[PDB]
């Protein structure tokens, strides 16, 4: 019941197809329909799904299909980065990266200080 | 066949006297005895076997051993490690000669050192030779395989070369083919020194005395030359690559690092400033004195004065170690400092073990293929000036899809691939019959189409084959442009008329045959009509999963396909949820138009050739499939009762609204 | 005539071109980026005039004009007169573009003003309306420089 | 607002090694 | 579910040590193996797993590869002695 | 069948095939924990 719509929509697909092939007449006149079509078949022989694209129209929509390949990794890759998991896969590295970072300028900085005062102290 | 193989020795004769009665010139006690210059060791059959798998302060790994003489064959070591030890040949090659006297370093520089070290080993996959007693730079680089190669891949293959005197215990090491267990009880007092019970693999080179260095020195030298001779498969250089790392040292250190850049192939010598003596005089020979000999008197001064002092060393023997310095300095091209100050000394190693290789850029482009490195190989390999010869970046690329290198191909097709070029019939018939690469099943399906047209193991498939491959899993009319007479007339005269104007729906094709989902998604990510190519490659990959159900096999190949399938189909329709959200005028006529390199059919028909589920269930196909129910008409407006009227009455149909043409 | 749509490095984007005289009409050039390129008029202007031959800037300056360039570039969705050959002021800008402008809204249109000796490979780019493949192998000892093969427009001056 | 911090300690990183150094070329020459 | 997802660990490491792991004799445990003790502990989602459901499906046909749409063809070849001869044998 | 007697060379080659999965395993469990919303801001803020 969470697909019943959903399937309706894949046997739908299956009637139409059938119907562009089907001849206009009904099947009981269908004689008629066999008639004529094997009158317009032998009059040339004797003697909607698939439109014939261009050569300069199947460019403006092949490029199309590839401005659409790269503007949607685009989307996945803003979503990824944005979503809960890899925006905090990120902050703990660089909070890491402030913990030796910090920690090297504490450690000189107390160097830092004391010659300031050997320097005031001998001046 | 090992014991019979590999022959020990010991001492037991002669018993000289060396400032006491009791201690040999062997080593061992007077009352203990039981080379052969003024020892007159006696030659045996070798009793030490097993495996000494260790306890205490974790490690129980397995501890396999041997014992072999000082003068053996380096060949026949060569044979035992690759056939009996389960050790297939590293692609790269690295030494842990440094101070044999245990010494102390910075936390941050060790772990930044020990770091860089383990990941090299990781992503090279080679062999450490170390001294193998857990004393100095062998404690040190024990402590560093244990820092983070314990958390991640602890299979590191790292070798130690001791002598059979200096290790302790040696009587828990009697027994053949016994696993003798090692507790870790350092005693303080022992001159036997303890070993580094996380090694993997241990070797007990004999000389046939006790407690006395040196002796694997010779064993080590003739086994790393016998190493490098070992011509690798890929065939890029002079065999394995080879590289050492020096870490502290003495005067040995110096000599063996001369050895090493003056030897045939030219070693280079990775030097790591920071650790003190050795090391960093090398390392001081190597930062201000250019081309050898350009050192001014001032610094040369400071050297002497800081050899005689500083490494409490003689300053008559002093110009003699200046000149052993200065000949180190005059092949500055193998010699490797590393000063500091993720970023590890991966990078640093590996552009030194491939500058001094005396190789082409294409065997270091093979060399950095075989490692798995992509960014070393683009820092290091891919430079400017660099004159690549015609061919060799072809035949990089081959080696790279059979592999199944995706950001070796990145890298490739980033550096000027001309994938048109590249492409032709016989390249990728042997595309297709290599099987350098993950498990496949291939075999299995064109031996079923072969059964169904009307097979040798040696059997090499044509592109008809495939083809029809295709055409027997894609079913129904699919008819592939291999089976075309277009096609099998240029193979009958041939087996840019060979190259393929489309190369990525052949990729399509070959990424889809041999299982690699990764090819799949990256030649995707690179071509036209790729909706088209993701749709057939959801079908084909649908289809050998009912293959491999119907087959049923080892499900993992099943439960893959169906997984790429339906991976490949949500890819389709996230892709047409795009085309839908971007604009919906191109987005129909997408939907619509015929493939002329697939079987000249379109999207639906092969979506439902396909059974994908939720491609045709969006909107767009919605509005297109209700469209085309219509025909050129607009009578809907509450229908089913409208268009009944209609068809009853055609007087009726004159009061409907009709699509302009 | 046509298209040079690159490869190599990624940018491989709709890259068509025109070859016309240095004494040509401006309203000649004006009706045909108008008409039959797809570019409606922009609502403002900026261009490249900078340093023509090769220089190298400090990350965060660079950074950080290249990130205004182009978001100014999004903004006002302007047209970008550049040299077109990339070494220098164009191979900056080029690197800025690839910047973060690969990463919002890739429809820039810049227009390179390039002469038809300065570019290399000028028998590849010999075609009425063929789409020739330029591969971006930068040769360090010829005198014809390079293309920026990010840029969506050309000009053969 | 961590990013900012990224940065602008790291300007501080880079001119600190500059200020503790004139500290001590002040202190050598007085 | 510690031996579901040991199970499921050596079956992601590879498949034929594991289908041994689950078979071999245990001396320390009174002879018997890792399956009979799992059903001797009355365990669920032990044997649910497909290490052991290739195992239990190999160790149904025997020494035999006759399976392709099976039901119908091993009730044809009981009937017919003639019809087991055009079946195909595992490599012994 | 399902009794097979494995002999003392190959029990060797299947037991360190047993301890090298627990302590692969216990990677795996201790990777997702510290890689978890959970743990991994439970180190954040110390």
């Known amino acids: 019941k969470s697909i019943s719509n959903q399937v309706w929509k894949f046997q739908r697909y299956q009637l139409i197809m059938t119907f562009h092939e089907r001849p206009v007449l009904p099947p009981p006149l269908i004689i008629f329909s066999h008639m004529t079509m094997i009158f317009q078949h032998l009059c040339c022989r004797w003697r909607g799904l698939k439109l014939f694209i261009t050569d300069d129209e199947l460019k403006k929509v092949h490029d199309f299909e590839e401005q659409c390949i790269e503007e949607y990794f685009r989307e996945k890759d803003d979503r990824f980065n944005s979503s809960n998991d890899e925006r905090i896969r990120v902050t703990s590295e660089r909070v890491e990266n402030m913990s030796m970072r910090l920690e090297e300028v504490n450690e000189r900085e107390h160097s830092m200080k004391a010659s300031l005062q050997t320097v005031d102290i001998r001046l | 066949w090992i014991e019979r193989a590999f022959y020990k020795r010991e001492c037991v004769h002669i018993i000289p006297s060396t400032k006491d009665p009791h201690r040999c010139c062997c080593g061992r006690l007077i009352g203990q005895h039981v080379w052969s210059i003024s020892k007159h060791t006696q030659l045996s059959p070798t009793d030490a076997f097993g495996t000494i798998e260790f306890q205490g302060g974790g490690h129980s790994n397995k501890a396999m051993y041997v014992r072999v003489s000082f003068d053996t064959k380096p060949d026949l070591l060569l044979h035992l490690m690759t056939k009996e030890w389960q050790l297939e040949l590293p692609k790269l090659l690295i030494s842990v000669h440094g101070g044999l006297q245990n010494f102390e370093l910075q936390p941050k520089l060790k772990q930044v050192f020990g770091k860089g070290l383990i990941k090299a080993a990781m992503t090279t ?48 090491l009697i027994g053949r083919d016994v696993v003798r267990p090692y507790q870790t009880m350092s005693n303080p007092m022992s001159k036997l020194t303890v070993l580094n019970s996380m090694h993997s693999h241990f070797i007990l080179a004999d000389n046939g005395t006790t407690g006395k260095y040196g002796a694997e020195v010779k064993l080590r030298r003739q086994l790393e030359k016998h190493i490098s001779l070992q011509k690798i498969n890929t065939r890029i250089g002079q065999g394995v690559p080879v590289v050492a790392l020096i870490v502290e040292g003495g005067p040995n250190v110096i000599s063996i690092v001369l050895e090493y850049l003056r030897d045939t192939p030219p070693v280079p010598v990775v030097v790591c400033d920071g650790s003190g003596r050795a090391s960093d005089i090398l390392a001081f020979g190597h930062k201000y004195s250019e081309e050898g000999g350009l050192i001014n008197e001032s610094l040369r001064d400071q050297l002497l004065v800081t050899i005689q002092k500083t490494f409490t060393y003689t300053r008559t023997q002093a110009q003699h170690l200046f000149i052993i310095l200065m000949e180190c300095m005059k092949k500055k091209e193998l010699i490797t400092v590393f000063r500091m100050g993720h970023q590890d000394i991966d990078l640093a190693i590996l552009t030194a073990l491939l500058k001094g290789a005396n190789a082409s850029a294409p065997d270091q482009l093979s060399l950095a293929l075989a490692w798995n490195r992509v960014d070393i190989a683009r820092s290091q390999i891919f430079i400017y000036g660099q004159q690549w010869p015609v061919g060799s970046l072809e035949q990089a690329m081959l080696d790279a899809l059979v592999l199944d290198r995706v950001d070796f191909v990145k890298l490739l097709i980033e550096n000027g691939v001309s994938m048109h070029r590249f492409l032709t019939i016989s390249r990728l018939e042997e595309l297709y019959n290599t099987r350098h690469g993950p498990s496949n099943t291939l075999y299995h399906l064109v031996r079923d189409v072969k059964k169904r047209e009307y097979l040798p193991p040696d059997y090499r498939i044509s592109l008809i084959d495939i083809g029809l491959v295709i055409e027997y899993l894609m079913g129904g009319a699919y008819r592939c442009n291999y089976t075309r007479k277009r096609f099998r007339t240029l193979y009958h005269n041939l087996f840019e008329i060979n190259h393929f104007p489309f190369p990525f729906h052949e990729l399509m094709v070959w990424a889809v045959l041999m299982k690699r989902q990764k090819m799949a998604l990256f030649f995707w990510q690179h071509g036209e009509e790729a909706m088209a190519k993701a749709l057939v490659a959801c079908k084909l990959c649908k289809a050998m999963a009912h293959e491999a159900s119907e087959n049923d096999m080892v499900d993992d190949i099943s439960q893959e396909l169906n997984h790429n399938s339906r991976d490949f189909g949500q890819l389709a329709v996230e892709l047409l949820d795009q085309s839908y959200k971007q604009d919906e005028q191109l987005a129909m006529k997408l939907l619509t138009y015929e493939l002329k390199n697939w079987s000249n059919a379109t999207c639906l028909q092969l979506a439902v050739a396909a059974k994908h589920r939720d491609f045709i269930a969006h909107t767009c196909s919605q509005m297109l499939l209700t469209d085309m129910w219509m025909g050129r008409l607009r009578m809907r407006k509450n229908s089913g009762l409208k268009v009944i009227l209609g068809i009853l009455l055609p007087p009726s149909i004159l009061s409907l609204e009709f699509k302009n043409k």
């Open chain 2, 125 to 172: 996959g080679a062999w450490i030779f170390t001294g193998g007693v857990n004393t100095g730079v062998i404690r040190h680089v024990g402590d560093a395989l244990k820092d983070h190669a314990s958390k991640s891949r602890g299979k590191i293959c790292t070798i130690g070369i001791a002598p059979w005197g200096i290790v302790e215990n040696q009587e828990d």
